[PDB]
Every structure is written in structure tokens, then in C-alpha cells.
Amino acid sequence: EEKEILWNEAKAFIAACYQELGKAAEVKDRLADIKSEIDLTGSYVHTKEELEHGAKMAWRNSNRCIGRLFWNSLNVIDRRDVRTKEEVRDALFHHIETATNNGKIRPTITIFPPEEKGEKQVEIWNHQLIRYAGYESDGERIGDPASCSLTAACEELGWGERTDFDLLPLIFRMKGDEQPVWYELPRSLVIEVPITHPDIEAFSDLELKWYGVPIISDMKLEVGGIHYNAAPFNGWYMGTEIGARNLADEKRYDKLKKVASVIGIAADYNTDLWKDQALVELNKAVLHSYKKQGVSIVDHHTAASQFKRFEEQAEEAGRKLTGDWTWLIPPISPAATHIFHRSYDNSIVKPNYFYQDKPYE
Amino acid sequence: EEKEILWNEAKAFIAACYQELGKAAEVKDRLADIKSEIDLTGSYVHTKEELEHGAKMAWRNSNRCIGRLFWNSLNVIDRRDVRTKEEVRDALFHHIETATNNGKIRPTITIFPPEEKGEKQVEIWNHQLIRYAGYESDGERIGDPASCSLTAACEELGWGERTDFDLLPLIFRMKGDEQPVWYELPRSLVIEVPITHPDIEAFSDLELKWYGVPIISDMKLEVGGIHYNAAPFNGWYMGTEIGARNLADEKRYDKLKKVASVIGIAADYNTDLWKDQALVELNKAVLHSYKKQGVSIVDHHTAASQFKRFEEQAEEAGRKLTGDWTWLIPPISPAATHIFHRSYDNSIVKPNYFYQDKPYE
Ligand code: HEM
Ligand code: HEM
Ligand SMILES: Nc1ccc2ccc(COc3cccc(CNCCc4ccccn4)c3)cc2n1
Ligand SMILES: Nc1ccc2ccc(COc3cccc(CNCCc4ccccn4)c3)cc2n1
Ligand SMILES: [Cl-]
Ligand SMILES: [Cl-]
């Protein structure tokens, strides 16, 4: 019953993958071997080639991702050999270092052992490997509200300085342990960017910063029926993620009214469009700051131009394009991108990245 | 067969409408009379009360409309008595005048005789009663590209000065005529707003203007199975419709690069976010200009605040809310509105406004 869905997903996956790799004649012998292994063992093991291409396919199929032009240059690190907390921690440290690449960010995924039969071998608690803590004590709000529950979980395990930019530790659980372990990130590994504005010297009075590399670490990678629940991956930021959402949302750092004040405009009348102007200057400052520091970043116009090339590459390859319009349009000037003016089929195609339940409340 | 769908839509409509009007006990006798009329005549005639409430319900159900808070104050003008071109033309003139209301815009719909049995009694060719012509001759682009086909149709019928802001004439066809007639709009009836900026005196060098009142005139109003294909209606503008779309879209007036130049910023690098900054200043100028001239207009923040009140009024009345997220979010700073951060059921509920085929190519 379980075995059965696995074998089907493996047929679809191996056929499609070997076809794209030009290995179509190797398909029957490989599915023979796979059908054996599933009967014998209940599961099967991807080749390095299948695992690498499967992770790239999963990015290519990620309907909500505007950055998919570059799906085929994904740097796949195969860490299915890890067995200990120390090895997990070091592989996550290595990912940060090699993905950061001194600021010239490399899109990277590190793939840990897949779930055996429902049972996770490694369970990562971080939403991103690098993220700020958040606190909420008697109406005192500090740091990143989106991190409050994970921050509270971490402080149950004996771990913050209660700045607005505390780095959460790595926190993950190994199969067999009842509690996750945590490890403080070495600060030598974490690039952060202070936010300054190209024109407005006072912008630095806000003392904003953000980290260089978004490394999403709580999504499941599914390839041919194998469930890689621990497979953190990163791209580089699109500047609106930082300037229009992380620093701007009322339920995040909520900085627009402070932005308005340091750029010298009143924040009193809706019709002054002060939120919109503050958003533009904050997003300009973010792109400027990342560029000045030599940390990779893309603006939403260039990103959508790249995504149009991805759409054209799909059609030219004879692949259906799928996409989630509500996530593809940027939160800043969306009608200034081609995305806004077309529609997308939101069908789910596998391999893909998927949400999974949090282990903390 | 035809009669049959009509009777069903009438049952659903009359029950729901009389219930909201507190006339639930009058329902059986009215559907009796309706069942008679449909058998006798093939159709039935709304009371002024049903027609007024049905048009209000249709606005309330308009999934894409952020302005629905005010659905119950819609000013319904019953023009089912018109029979001649002159009466149609005068009713459309009257609509412009009374909806404009010297700039204090009144949401108004004028309802013409419904389609008999598929056959339109009046067929309005305008997309809006007030709109600018568009021209496209040997790569010379003038006026509003969205009006090119209707403008070309109008010039087949003997009607432009080829400014960028020529008013199209009213153009409509009466049952029985093979060709529509057209009538030049009296300029005394058309308020236009020159676009100036509150801070940047050079903005007036762009010589932009827009008209005061958007009067959508090509949608079908359906109420209880009766198809009012000619029922032009208006609200007031939300400023982004003008500043983020009509004047900004590359396939409309395409003014952002000229905006950038008069506000003194370079239009060279995506990462300067010059399109976003130009959009904000253009949208500020639009709101400022309408306000200075005393013409009603709403900014997208106030509008979304109003729409949140509509959502709360729906829940408090025990009505399901429907909505189209992709049209409800504004094209400027959408994540700064509550709409962006929630989802909406896009189910179609009647009475409603619907697209219908254009009569011109
Ligand atoms: C190379 C640079 C990249 C850029 C600029 C980029 C851009 C983005 C953006 C802006 C989002 C929307 C998130 C939001 O609205 O907050 C997104 C979603 C996503 N991206 Fe990419 N991305 C990139 C690389 C990657 C990589 C390397 C992968 C995986 C291998 C990936 C997989 C996804 C997935 C799964 C989502 C959806 C997540 C969800 O549903 O919550 N992206 N991307
Ligand atoms: C009172 C002021 C009003 C405001 C500010 C407002 C705002 C808007 C906006 C911004 C749109 C989206 C159009 C676009 O994205 O270009 C829209 C769509 C719509 N509005 Fe409203 N509206 C108002 C009044 C009305 C009235 C009076 C009716 C009818 C009685 C109406 C029916 C609709 C319909 C049917 C649509 C969708 C049209 C389509 O699908 O193309 N609205 N509204
Ligand atoms: N550069 C990059 C590169 C890769 C990325 C991979 C994943 C993500 C995930 O990102 C989010 C996850 C959860 C919530 C949010 C908040 N945004 C929501 C967007 C939205 C659109 C429409 C309606 C509601 N919400 C983001 C980011 C990546 N970023
Ligand atoms: N103040 C008001 C008041 C009432 C209005 C009634 C109707 C309309 C119709 O408006 C449009 C009709 C056709 C095209 C467009 C262009 N915008 C498209 C919006 C969009 C969203 C997402 C994806 C693609 N397109 C508008 C306007 C009214 N306006
Ligand atoms: Cl983020
Ligand atoms: Cl318009």
C-alpha cells in the first residue's frame, strides 16, 4: 500500500529525469533495480545524479518562485551520509559558508537523509538557518515577531540578548532523541548588511540591518516518492522581501513610520501616499546597501525580467509553465512587471518543495 | 426551456430580495404573479423596488470591486421607458450630469430596457461614457491605445482631432437599426482634471489630464434572470486606476519615463527603483489634483480601509463575502493593505455585473 505509491512516483520521476538527462535507454534497467529495492527494502536510494537533478527539477516546479531562471545551476550538496548531531551541525555550517561565498551568493541545497518510512532522520526546527529572534513580554516587542514561537521554544532548551537582531541558534532533532539540540552560529559565518540610503544620510539613524543569505530550512523536498524533509536551500534575496515585507510589515519590524520620519515626509494623511514613498525609499536603501557591501541581491524589475526569460525557456523546451500569480507578483509596483499582466497555471508538478508541520507549537 | 431558467433565477432573486427588504410575506403572491407573466409573456418585469435593490445587490456581489462598502447608497435611475435614440442619448447625458454632481460624484446606474429574448433593445458601444480616443497610424501613437478599436469604429461612422485627449462620442445602436448612432459629448458636461504635483512645479510640463468620472457602460447587469445589457454605472476613481494604470501602463499612456525626468531622477538602472518612485509621485499628483479641483477620488489605503469595513459589515449581516484577491489588491504597495494578507472566495453570486461581447471588432 505504501510501497505502491512509492513505485508509481519513482516511475514518473525516473522516466522524466533520465529523459532530460539524455539517459532514456537506461530507464528500464534502473526501474527494474528500483522495483527490486522497494520490494526488498520498502524504499530505494537515488543516485547522486538523480538527487541533483531532482532537486533542480523541484526548484523549476516551484510555482511561487520568481527566481527559477537559474534552476539548473543549483549547487546540490549530498549529505545523506550524516548520522550524528555534530555532522548535521557542521553540514549546516558548511552550507552557510559555501552558499554565502564571501557575498557572491551561490544557490545551494544541502540534502540530509530522507524520511525512512514516515520517520524523520533529522528534523530541522529553524525556518531559515539564519534568522533573528523575536520577543513579546508584557507588550514589549523586540526583534522579529515571526520568530516568537521558535525563540520561545529555544529558550526552553537553555538558550537571547534581546536586541532586535539576535541570531537564533541552529536547532534540530535527531531520530531517537526526545529533544532537539541547539548550536550558536559562529558570527564569522554570518554576513549582515547595515541599511543605509544612497542619498539620505539620516537613514542610518534607524540602525536597520538584515542578514545576507535567506536559507529556507523547513520545507520538504520530494523527489520520486522519497521525502527529504531536511534539505535546506538558499537563493539570494529579492530586495522587496526585505524592504517591503521583513522591515515594513506591521507584524514584522514595522519600520515605515520611522522611515517616513527620517526621509523627511509627514506620516499623517493617507492621500500623501507616505507609506508608498517610505516603501520605495526603504527598498532603494536595501538594494543600495547590499550592493555597496558586495552581497548578492536582485531588484524586482530585474527578477521579473529574468522570470520572463524562464517562461520563454520553458516554452522553447516544450515544458508546461506553472506558477502562482499571487506570489510571483512583487509587493512593490506589481503592475510594472509583465507577471501582473498575465495568468499562470497553479498546478502542482513534482519533484517539488512542500510545507510540513512545525515540530514546535 | 428558456422560460425555465428564468423562473428559477426569479425564485432565488425574489426570495432573497424581499427577505432583505423585510417583505418576505409578499413573496408567494409576487412569484405567483411572476409565474403567470412568464407563462403568458415569456418574461417578467421588475418593480422599481426590485430593480433598485437588484442593482445594489449586484454591486455588493462584484468580487473585483474594492469600493463595495457603499453598495446600498447606489443611485438607481430607471430608464426602462426609453424607446428612441434621442431618449437614450439624453438619459446618458443626464447620467453624466447627475453622477458628476459638480465634482461631488454620486454612484449612479441608469438602467435601460433589458434584452427581450436575446435581442438587445439598446446596445452601448462605449466602454465608458467618457473616455479618450486612441490612434495608431504608421507607428505614430496618439491618445489612449485601449480606445484604438472603438476609435476606428467611430471613424467608420463619420466621426477625432488627434490630440492625446479627444473625447470619444457616445455611440450606441437601437434594436432595428443596422448601424449605431454617435453623439458628441457636450463639453460643459465633462469635468477633466489637469494633473499637477503638490511639490514639484515642473510636473505640469507633462500636460497630463484625466476625466473626472469613470462611467462603465459595457457590462451586463443581471437581476433575477433579466439581462440588462445596457446599464451604465459609475463610482468615483481610486487614484491608482489613473496613476498606476491609465497613465503608467506601457500599453496605455506610458508616462513613467517622462515622470522620472520631471521629478529629477535618472531612469537608467532597475536598482534605482525609478519606476517605483515615479509611480508614487504620479499617484500623489493624481490625488492632489482631484482634491484641489473638488472632484471625488479615493486613495488605495482609504479604499482598503473602507473595504475592511465592508468585510465586517458582511459578517455582521451573516452574508458570505466573495472577492477576487487579484483585483482587490491595489497595484501600488499592495502588501500595505489588509487585503493582500488574506484570501477571498471568488464564487460568483447573482445579481451581478458581467462582461459581454463587444459589438465592434
Ligand atoms: C536564486 C535566487 C532566488 C530568488 C531571487 C528567489 C525569489 C523568491 C521569492 C521572492 C519568493 C517568494 C517568497 C515571498 O513572497 O516571501 C520565492 C519563493 C520560493 N522560492 Fe525562490 N528564489 C530564489 C532561489 C530559490 C531556490 C534556490 C529555491 C530552491 C532550490 C527556491 C524555491 C522557492 C520556493 C519553494 C518558494 C516558495 C516558498 C513558499 O511557498 O513559502 N528559490 N522565491
Ligand atoms: C464608489 C466608488 C467605487 C470605487 C472607488 C470602486 C473601485 C473599483 C476598482 C479599483 C475596480 C478595479 C478595476 C481595475 O482594477 O481597473 C473596481 C471593479 C469593479 N467595480 Fe467598483 N468601485 C466603485 C463603485 C462601483 C459601482 C458603483 C459599481 C456598480 C454599481 C461597481 C462595480 C464594479 C465592478 C463590476 C467591477 C469589476 C469590473 C471588471 O470585472 O472588469 N463599482 N471597482
Ligand atoms: N529570495 C528567496 C529565495 C528562496 C526563497 C524560498 C522560500 C521563501 C519562502 O518565503 C515565505 C514563506 C512564508 C511566508 C512568506 C511571507 N510572504 C508571503 C507572500 C505572500 C504572497 C501573497 C499572499 C500572501 N503572502 C514568505 C522565500 C525565498 N526567497
Ligand atoms: N473606480 C471604479 C469604479 C467602478 C469600476 C467598475 C469597473 C471597472 C473595470 O475596470 C477595468 C476593466 C477592464 C480592464 C481593467 C484593467 N485593470 C485590470 C485589473 C487587473 C487585475 C489583475 C490582473 C489583471 N488586471 C480595468 C473599473 C471601475 N473603477
Ligand atoms: Cl526572509
Ligand atoms: Cl479607467
Swiss-Prot record, chains A, B:
State the InterPro entries in the record: Nitric_oxide_synthase_Oase-su (IPR017142), NOS (IPR050607), NOS_dom_1 (IPR044943), NOS_dom_2 (IPR044940), NOS_dom_3 (IPR044944), NOS_N (IPR004030), NOS_N_sf (IPR036119)
What's a GO biological-process term for it? nitric oxide biosynthetic process
- Gene3D superfamilies attached here? Nitric Oxide Synthase, Chain A, domain 1, Nitric Oxide Synthase, Chain A, domain 3, Nitric Oxide Synthase,Heme Domain,Chain A domain 2
Q: What is its EC number?
A: 1.14.14.47
| Reaction catalysed by this enzyme | 3 reduced [flavodoxin] + 2 L-arginine + 4 O2 = 3 oxidized [flavodoxin] + 2 L-citrulline + 2 nitric oxide + 4 H2O + 5 H(+)
Cofactor(s), by name = heme; (6R)-L-erythro-5,6,7,8-tetrahydrobiopterin
Q: Give the record's cofactor note, including how many are bound.
A: Tetrahydrobiopterin (H4B). Can also use tetrahydrofolate (THF) in place of tetrahydrobiopterin (H4B) but binds THF with much lower affinity than H4B.
Q: What class of enzyme is it?
A: oxidoreductase
Please tell me where heme binds in this chain. C65
Assembly description: Homodimer.
Q: What is this protein called?
A: Nitric oxide synthase oxygenase
What organism does the record attribute this protein to?
Bacillus subtilis (strain 168)
Give the gene symbol: nos
